Amino acid sequence: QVLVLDGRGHLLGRLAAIVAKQVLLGRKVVVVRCEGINISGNFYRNKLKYLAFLRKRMNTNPSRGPYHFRAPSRIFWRTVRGMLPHKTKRGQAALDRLKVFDGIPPPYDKKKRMVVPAALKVVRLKPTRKFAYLGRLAHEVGWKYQAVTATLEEKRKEKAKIHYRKKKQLMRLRKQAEKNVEKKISKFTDVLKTHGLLV
Amino acid sequence: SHRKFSAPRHGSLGFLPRKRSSRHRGKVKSFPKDDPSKPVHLTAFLGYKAGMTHIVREVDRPGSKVNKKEVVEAVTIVETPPMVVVGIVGYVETPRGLRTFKTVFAEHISDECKRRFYKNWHKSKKKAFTKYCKKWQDDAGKRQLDKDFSSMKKYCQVIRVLAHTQMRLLPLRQKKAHLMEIQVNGGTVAEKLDWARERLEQQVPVSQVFGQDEMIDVIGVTKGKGYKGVTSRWHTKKLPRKTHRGL
Amino acid sequence: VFRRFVEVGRVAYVSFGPHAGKLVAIVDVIDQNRALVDGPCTRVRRQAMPFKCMQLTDFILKFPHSARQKYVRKAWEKADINTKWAATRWAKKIEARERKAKMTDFDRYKVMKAKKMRNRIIKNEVKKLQRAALLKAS
Amino acid sequence: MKTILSNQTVDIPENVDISLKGRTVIVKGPRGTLRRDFNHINVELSLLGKKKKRLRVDKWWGNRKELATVRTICSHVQNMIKGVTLGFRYKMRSVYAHFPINVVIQENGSLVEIRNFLGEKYIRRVRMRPGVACSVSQAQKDELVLEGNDIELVSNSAALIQQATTVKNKDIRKFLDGIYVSEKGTVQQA
Amino acid sequence: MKASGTLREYKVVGRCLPTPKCRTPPLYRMRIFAPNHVVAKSRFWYFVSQLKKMKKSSGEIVYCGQVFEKSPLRVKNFGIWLRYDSRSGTHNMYREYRDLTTAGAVTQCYRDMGARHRARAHSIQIMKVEEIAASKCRRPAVKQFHDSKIKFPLPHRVLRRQHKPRFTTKRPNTFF
Amino acid sequence: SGRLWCKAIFAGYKRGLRNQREHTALLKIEGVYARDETEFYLGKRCAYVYKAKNNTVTPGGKPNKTRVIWGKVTRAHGNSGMVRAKFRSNLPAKAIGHRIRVMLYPSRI
RNA sequence: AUAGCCGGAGCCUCGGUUGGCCUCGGAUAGCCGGUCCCCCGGGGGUCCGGUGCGGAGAGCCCUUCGUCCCGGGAAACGGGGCGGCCGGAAAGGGGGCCGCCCUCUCGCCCGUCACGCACCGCACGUUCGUGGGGAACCUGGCGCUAAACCAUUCGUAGACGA
RNA sequence: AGCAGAACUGGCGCUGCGGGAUGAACCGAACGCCGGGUUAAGGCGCCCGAUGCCGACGCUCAUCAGACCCCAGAAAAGGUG
RNA sequence: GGCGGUGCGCCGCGACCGGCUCCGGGACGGCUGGGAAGGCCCCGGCGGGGAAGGUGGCCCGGGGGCCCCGGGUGUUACAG
């Protein structure tokens, strides 16, 4: 009932356009690993794209001007907000269903992350083109927690490896379990093959 | 049109919010960074301004006109009584910033530090930390205190210490001590935590923290001057005498 | 590295189109993104069909680059692609999909009932080996 | 247009023992092991032939620009073969008009001290790239000799000290001073 | 003329109306590539009005019919001559194509010229399409397919049907 | 013992870009994403279930707080599996993005 | 620091929903899983199998009409009752393990016996739901006997507040 | 010259509607109150109804890319991109 | 109780008929160049030719070592 989308390898505008439509349909979408979001075009193109965005501020009072968010999660939150009717009541009610996170929170580390193949770099971009990581772009423009998130993301990398290697050994005993017991499960096995489930 | 003759602007915009300070005690916005090679030591201290006077000393700067000559220098006198360590605090480090992990105080806290936890000392019953000090004479309490200390061994990255000044030795009218987190910079987390555990309820003199001929930083609140115009606050040009609505 | 190559005589599986789900054999390459192809034994008339809707298999039957439809059928029957394709694990999991698709609601109930005790024996079998391992682990 | 297939086979000698995983090749042999990555080009690397005597690259449906990048792989793999068989010896002169350019090497070929360059009080300190050995040869005064196995690292470190000794705001047509690359050779000959 | 869909070859003949001066006018046949026969006869009178002193009022259509491909299952090489219009000046070309049908090669010619030189179909005057042998081809793009042992893989298979599994778990595999 | 209706989301009214016609509702039934799969749901009865403050009667049961707006599925909309529906009373805009039920008892099978 | 914590039924109000997936990393001119014959303190290397992913999200797990007996298959380690023990810190679980006094091969799959308003064709049915909040009623146990503001004073402050 | 003065016709003035982000003159189309259907001009990644087509063929990398009449900005020349 | 008329208190359902629409599934026929192509009858049979995107066979080279990859001649040879 809650969409947990992994942001690694996902294009900024293609993911935001699909999330914005799903969020407006009453679906709670949680986007995770926003530092893995990457944008087509060379890195130097996107930097001045964001640096000239920084220059756009209110002259008389910059505190009332555009709030330039530097975190990768809030940058992705900004581009979804521009894809939504946030000036209306239903637009702001939609944005409450969106939840962005840098790295992976402990609420969402022990969960399966969904992947949008339509909003993917490997699908929508030619292999000879250039792309820019949002995580590198954020720290290079004012984000202070890239190395902070990298070590905490490093910490859960072997912690899931322990779970996965235990998971393989857990189902290695499962796959070996049929190997001793075909003589008394063939009654259930063949009817699962006539209907096409193990063939 | 453009300005006829160029001139730099009055007042820096880095100190733009010229409001009354929300705090009265100086705050360390950025503590010195630490490396594990150095031993554990204090990085900040809290003093009180007394007055100023002259000094006479020899200058030993090569290549100057004033080399090997006697000078006078304006020097501040800051009376710095030793602190009493009353607690420690641990900080886990998050992708959203720096977050406090757990605060562990002493068994018994001196009444000078107890002044801070009350807006009105006269009407209060002085009941602060009365049930917290009951945790140190039960066997479940000591195991919980060691479990809290062992938790800070694993997860805490930055460890500060809670120490307060001593108003009894000062001639000031007030008796309310000022609490302050002081970052302990030194070796790894484990020996850093053991050093602060030993220093609990102990006198901390100035000589442990600072030394002579050493660059330090002074943090404090400016002298109050009240509501002021642009001529006093911003040092703008006074208008001529012939102005009608003021100059 | 690549193991399947678009070349004269490779048997291919059609992805989409009116002839989807059938086998077909490459005769000649017309353009960069289109090839002349002929499924003489799989009810696929000689025509041009692009690379968009074909999945190329590891089956190669040899005939000249512009041989007529008579020799393609003879090479298809000599190699006997139709029997070997059904023995491929590719087609075994292809044909299981419509078995799930045509599965009747009554057939759906019998699968669910059979899945219950089949998992009961495996879970009971797995349970015996986790406890047997821990005595062997100590 | 798109060229349907382009290739260029690299014949390797008996002393070099190459192997590849994915798109990264490794080159080992007498003088050590060299590794270089080629993930930026998206080509096919095929090591066929028994007794592994040649390596062939491939690029299907390539166009004029990237087919030019097919050949520079053959130059790069051949340079890795040369550095493992015979290495790379770079000899650099020290040209000075009046002030003798004093040179001395600290920590065994990883750091260069350059003193009295144009009579400057400043001392110039250049850090050599890892894998590069630095020393002064014998039987001639003005030589600084760089040793190594990778052509990228040795020639970059040669260009580090060449750019470190430049004459500022002067007529360089008259002021001809600095440390410049003289001879580009190998460690051992055949 | 709108180059809509695939083109069709039409064999349109015509002549002048009988006059008191001339008993039977000569008959003129052309090869016209057009989507339908209604626009083929309009295109027929366009070129005839340039070559001869002919108009549609003084002329008539004797036979308007479509000729079919004689070998639509044989891969062939087509030589196509151009008379397009640019923004500055008009130019002639010779372009080579490889297709099963003559009308398909003209269709491939119309889509290629608009892609390269941004030339519209009304600015393009086709004149001659001729079957040529493989050994007489000139452009290396066409000649690279003249191989009895042609062999190539599909290196980067751009996967389609990307939205039917709009949200999935496994990272998709662009390699087969 | 379980669900007998397909999950559908009231995406919005049948509309233009600057004009909406709130007498016809657009439905996004879960599982259908093409025009040719919308043929099964044509003619099915749709209902929007909601609860209010005052208690109203319930057919065959004690009067509850729940209320419905009955309607039917008219015809397919768009190309990507959307569909139109028409109710007796026009749906309130509070139901935008909320779950409504489409039932199967108007069955053609 | 707090003049509330644990466990039973009824009434108003707020509303949405109609089974859960408990997780490697990562590539896309490449992957996945096992054999380890090999080398060191988990990695590398080799081999074997799949690769339009079937150790597949085009997927997996649970499945519920209920009660009474009897017979067959599994099961004897197993289903369910309390205390600890540790594993969790990036925004942290009633997660697992040790022994307990009672429980049955009752659990589940096949087949026999019998019963269950069979409300006589009709709608918001069917859950998450001991859902959140609020008064009042329950029963007992466990407990705690505080601060802020005004006033006055200070003057490191100040138009008044602060 | 969004300047002044003429010829034919159509519009605004006197006129709402859909579209061009907006808009007196542009495109389509003119109006009693409604239901169903179908279109014009325009469009169909999100705002925003509609391509979530297994869309076809090619071109293009910009460290100032480009994106739809009216229309809202550009030239001569040069480029071994 | 039966027939005719009006209506059901409220919430609803179904059936058939007619009108206006959108969509789907079957079967039949006409024209062409009286379709073009295409399939089968040994390559449909016989005779005569031609080159190439050169199949056997020959030569050279390289990879194990008995098949594959290149280059050259050729006219069906064990493919076309």
UniProtKB/Swiss-Prot annotation, chain B:
One of its GO terms (molecular function) is RNA binding. GO terms for biological process: translation. The modification Tele-methylhistidine is found at residue 244. Constitutively monomethylated at His-244 by METTL18. Methylation at His-244 regulates translation elongation by slowing ribosome traversal on tyrosine codons: slower elongation provides enough time for proper folding of synthesized proteins and prevents cellular aggregation of tyrosine-rich proteins. It is not required for incorporation of RPL3 into ribosomes. It comes from the Eukaryota. Residues 1-36 are annotated as: Disordered. Residues 17-30 have a biased composition (Basic residues). There is a cross-link at residues 38, 223, 225 (Glycyl lysine isopeptide (Lys-Gly) (interchain with G-Cter in SUMO2)). Its main location: nucleus. The keyword Ligase does not apply. GO terms for cellular component: cytosolic large ribosomal subunit; nucleolus. The modification N6-acetyllysine is found at residue 135. It is found in: Nucleus, Nucleolus; Cytoplasm. Keywords: Acetylation, Cytoplasm, Isopeptide bond, Methylation, Nucleus, Phosphoprotein, Ribonucleoprotein, Ribosomal protein, Ubl conjugation. The modification Phosphoserine is found at residue 12. Component of the large ribosomal subunit. Interacts with DHX33. Component of the large ribosomal subunit. The ribosome is a large ribonucleoprotein complex responsible for the synthesis of proteins in the cell. Belongs to the universal ribosomal protein uL3 family. This is Large ribosomal subunit protein uL3. The chain holds residues 2 to 248 of 403 of the full protein.
UniProtKB/Swiss-Prot annotation, chain C:
The modification N6-acetyllysine is found at residues 78, 84. Transmembrane segments: none annotated. GO terms for cellular component: cytosolic large ribosomal subunit. Keywords: Acetylation, Cytoplasm, Isopeptide bond, Phosphoprotein, Repeat, Ribonucleoprotein, Ribosomal protein, Ubl conjugation. Component of the large ribosomal subunit. One of its GO terms (biological process) is ribosomal large subunit biogenesis. GO terms for molecular function: RNA binding; structural constituent of ribosome. Belongs to the eukaryotic ribosomal protein eL14 family. It is found in: Cytoplasm. Component of the large ribosomal subunit. The ribosome is a large ribonucleoprotein complex responsible for the synthesis of proteins in the cell. The modification N6-succinyllysine is found at residue 84. The keyword Acetylation applies. Disulfide bonds: none annotated. This is Large ribosomal subunit protein eL14. There is a cross-link at residue 123 (Glycyl lysine isopeptide (Lys-Gly) (interchain with G-Cter in SUMO2)). The modification Phosphoserine is found at residue 138. It comes from Oryctolagus cuniculus.
From Swiss-Prot, chain D:
SUPFAM superfamilies: Ribosomal protein L6. Keywords: Acetylation, Cytoplasm, Ribonucleoprotein, Ribosomal protein. Signal peptide: none annotated. GO terms for biological process: cytoplasmic translation. The keyword Repeat does not apply. The modification N6-acetyllysine is found at residue 121. InterPro entries: Ribosomal_uL6-like (IPR000702), Ribosomal_uL6-like_a/b-dom_sf (IPR036789), Ribosomal_uL6_a/b-dom (IPR020040), Ribosomal_uL6_CS2 (IPR002359). One of its GO terms (molecular function) is rRNA binding. It comes from the Eukaryota. It is found in: Cytoplasm. One of its GO terms (cellular component) is cytosolic large ribosomal subunit. Belongs to the universal ribosomal protein uL6 family. Component of the large ribosomal subunit. Component of the large ribosomal subunit. The ribosome is a large ribonucleoprotein complex responsible for the synthesis of proteins in the cell. This is Large ribosomal subunit protein uL6. It comes from Oryctolagus cuniculus.
From Swiss-Prot, chain F:
One of its GO terms (biological process) is translation. InterPro entries: Ribosomal_eL33, Ribosomal_eL33_CS, Ribosomal_eL33_sf, Transl_B-barrel_sf. Keywords: Acetylation, Cytoplasm, Ribonucleoprotein, Ribosomal protein, RNA-binding, tRNA-binding. The keyword Signal does not apply. The modification N6-acetyllysine is found at residues 7, 62. The modification N6-succinyllysine is found at residue 62. Pfam families: Ribosomal_L35Ae. It is found in: Cytoplasm. Its main location: cytoplasm. Coiled coil: none annotated. The keyword Ribosomal protein applies. PROSITE patterns: RIBOSOMAL_L35AE. GO terms for molecular function: structural constituent of ribosome; tRNA binding. One of its GO terms (cellular component) is cytosolic large ribosomal subunit. Component of the large ribosomal subunit. Belongs to the eukaryotic ribosomal protein eL33 family. This is Large ribosomal subunit protein eL33. The gene is RPL35A.
